[PDB]
Amino acid sequence: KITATPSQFQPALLNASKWIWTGENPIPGGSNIISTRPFRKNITAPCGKCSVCATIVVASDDAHTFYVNGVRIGTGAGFRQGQALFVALQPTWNLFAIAGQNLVANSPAGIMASILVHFSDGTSETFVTDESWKTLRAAPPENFQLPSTNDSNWPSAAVQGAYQNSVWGPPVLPPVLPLRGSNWIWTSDNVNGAAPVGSRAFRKTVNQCTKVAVCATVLIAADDRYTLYVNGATVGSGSSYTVADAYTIPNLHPTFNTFAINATNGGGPAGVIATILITYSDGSNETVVTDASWKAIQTIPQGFQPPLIDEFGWESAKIIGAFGVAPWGAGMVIPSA
Ligand SMILES: *[C@@H]1O[C@H](CO)[C@@H](O[C@@H]2O[C@H](CO)[C@@H](O)[C@H](O)[C@H]2NC(C)=O)[C@H](O)[C@H]1NC(C)=O
Numbered sequence: 001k002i003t004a005t006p007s008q009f010q011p012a013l014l015n016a017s018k019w020i021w022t023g024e025n026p027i028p029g030g031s032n033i034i035s036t037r038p039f040r041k042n043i044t045a046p047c048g049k050c051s052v053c054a055t056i057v058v059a060s061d062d063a064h065t066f067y068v069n070g071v072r073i074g075t076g077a078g079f080r081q082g083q084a085l086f087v088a089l090q091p092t093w094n095l096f097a098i099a100g101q102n103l104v105a106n107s108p109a110g111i112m113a114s115i116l117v118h119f120s121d122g123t124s125e126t127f128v129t130d131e132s133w134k135t136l137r138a139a140p141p142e143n144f145q146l147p148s149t150n151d152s153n154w155p156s157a158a159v160q161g162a163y164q165n166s167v168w169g170p171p172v173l174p175p176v177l178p179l180r181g182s183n184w185i186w187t188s189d190n191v192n193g194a195a196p197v198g199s200r201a202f203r204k205t206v207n208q209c210t211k212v213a214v215c216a217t218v219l220i221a222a223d224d225r226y227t228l229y230v231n232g233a234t235v236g237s238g239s240s241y242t243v244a245d246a247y248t249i250p251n252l253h254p255t256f257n258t259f260a261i262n263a264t265n266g267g268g269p270a271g272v273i274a275t276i277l278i279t280y281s282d283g284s285n286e287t288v289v290t291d292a293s294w295k296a297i298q299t300i301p302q303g304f305q306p307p308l309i310d311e312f313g314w315e316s317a318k319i320i321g322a323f324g325v326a327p328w329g330a331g332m333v334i335p336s337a
Pocket residue numbers: 072073074075076084085086087283284285286
């Protein structure tokens with residue numbers, strides 16, 4: 001049962017996390033052979049909280065594949081910057097599994113991750129890679145990542161370093177979500193690089209009736225100002241086109257969700273841009289961006305935000321341009337993952 005409500009996005013941090021490998025070289029940050037190595041950790045929910053979903057940040061020397069409860073949720077590489085991943089969880093326990101690869105002979109090897117678990121009651125806790133994870137001094141067995149594998153006589157992982165103290169130094173957090181891939185949109189009264197003074201509304205519905213939606217993460221900015229609504233409830237608002245806002249919606253409807261925006265132009269150019277990531281209970285996700293599949297209207301009707309209004313006399317939203325275009329450029333400050 002979920003009492004958590006929409007909130008400012010809380011970044012997962014690598015500060016308490018550790019670099020792990022097998023200990024085949026007993027020198028942490030020491031030279032290791034070209035190899036692939038498994039890592040597993042069963043994490044159980046405290047008390048009587050349920051776990052709902054997780055924000056994940058993961059970094060690797062040299063590369064990684066990340067699994068949750070047997071499902072591949074991502075592939076990545078590199079220790080200078082982490083990769084953001086989002087996933088729905090089982091309510092009481094979750095098996096995290098990583099395949100790490102060292103790709104350069106005589107080079108250091110290591111995996112670092114932070115798993116920020118969001119609970120049914122609106123609390124969070126960070127879990128990290130450390131000595132309590134299990135590994136093998138061999139290539140991963142077939143199905144090493146499924147819960148059905150017994151990791152009981154696997155050895156402990158060996159710590160290679162901490163966030164501040166390691167051969168790698170501290171990885172930079174990635175952006176929570178990319179704006180690359182999204183579009184500044186407006187009503188079709190936005191011509192010759194300016195739009196009238198006034199408020200305009202935008203709507204997007206996601207409805208996969210054969211899947212169970214769990215959590216959404218939203219990244220949004222507007223020239224001049226916006227208010228954002230999910231299923232008619234206020235999520236938040238901002239007034240900056242140079243600093244974006246990120247939100248978590250932990251209480252999604254399982255099949256049908258409507259995002260609505262009242263955005264206001266104070267004068268000159270105008271636009272609204274957003275990236276939305278939705279997690280599904282099978283471990284899959286969907287990305288939605290501001291584009292021409294959104295609906296827009298120039299006079300905002302009463303109830304523009306309720307989920308099931310009549311969209312007659314809403315137009316396709318106009319693409320002003322892909323993220324990057326003048327006048328706003330590529331420099332938006334995006335919260336960390
Ligand atoms: C959302 O899910 C999919 C798979 O369930 C992930 O990715 C595709 O998977 C890889 C892994 O990063 C990407 O490189 C590709 O771009 C996708 N396939 C292509 C282009 O063929 C993705 O990681 C997940 N997102 C999360 C967990 O945040």
